[PDB]
């Protein structure tokens, strides 16, 4: 009982254990943008309970949008914001 | 003058060590691989005025 939460954890340098991973670039950045866009992603922890597959985030919106990523065609398509357009490049001081 | 230019040519031809095959370095290919150099096409006088202002 003579150790704390930090002192009982299997740590490597003062704040935890840090080991080199070799995750595929695409899948990593996929789950990264999945969390950064909606608020959920799959769990990259390698044991955590050693049963199947849990989502880690705002898990309530995960089942609402079926667990989609950014690279996939979305469910919702509504309320687009309206912008000007002058794609001709022929009128000077009117092109954008 | 002709004698001295002959002297310079003979000192070139004497002390010719062969090219000494190294590993090629390519400094400007290493500069433009970075995110700090861009490339363009300019008149030579514009670049000379640039180089003089930069040295100043």
């Amino acid at each position: 009982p003579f150790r704390t939460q930090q002192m009982a954890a299997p740590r490597n340098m003062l704040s935890g254990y840090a080991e080199p991973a070799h995750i595929n670039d695409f899948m990593f950045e996929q789950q990264r943008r999945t969390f950064a866009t909606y608020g959920y992603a799959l769990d990259p922890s390698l044991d955590n309970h050693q049963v199947s597959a849990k989502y880690i985030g705002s898990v309530e919106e995960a089942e609402k949008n079926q667990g989609l990523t950014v690279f996939e065609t979305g469910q919702k398509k509504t309320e687009k914001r309206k912008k000007f357009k002058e794609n001709d490049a022929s009128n000077i001081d009117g092109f954008l | 003058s002709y004698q001295k230019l002959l002297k310079y040519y003979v000192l070139n031809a004497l002390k010719h060590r062969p090219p000494k095959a190294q590993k090629k370095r390519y400094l400007f290919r290493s500069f433009k691989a970075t995110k700090f150099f861009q490339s363009t096409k300019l008149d030579w006088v514009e670049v000379g005025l640039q180089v003089c202002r930069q040295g100043y």
Partner: protein, 88 residues
Amino acid sequence: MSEEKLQEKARKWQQLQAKRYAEKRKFGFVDAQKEDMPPEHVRKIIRDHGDMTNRKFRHDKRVYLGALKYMPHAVLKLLENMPMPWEQ
């Protein structure tokens, strides 16, 4: 499960496998080339950094002195390409 769920699972495996093994993601893929820039870009950069007295460009004062060690090489590449009296 249902045909809808299995078709959605097919879509969200085909899109994944398409975007994960693209031609631009193979191992020895040298990515695209740095291209030419418009010649007005370096002109306005040189012109705004006038004599480096503005307070707005005080973070690039350190880089110009750093570039001082490569001025002889820039001089060499400059004078190497002098334009040849039959050229305007």
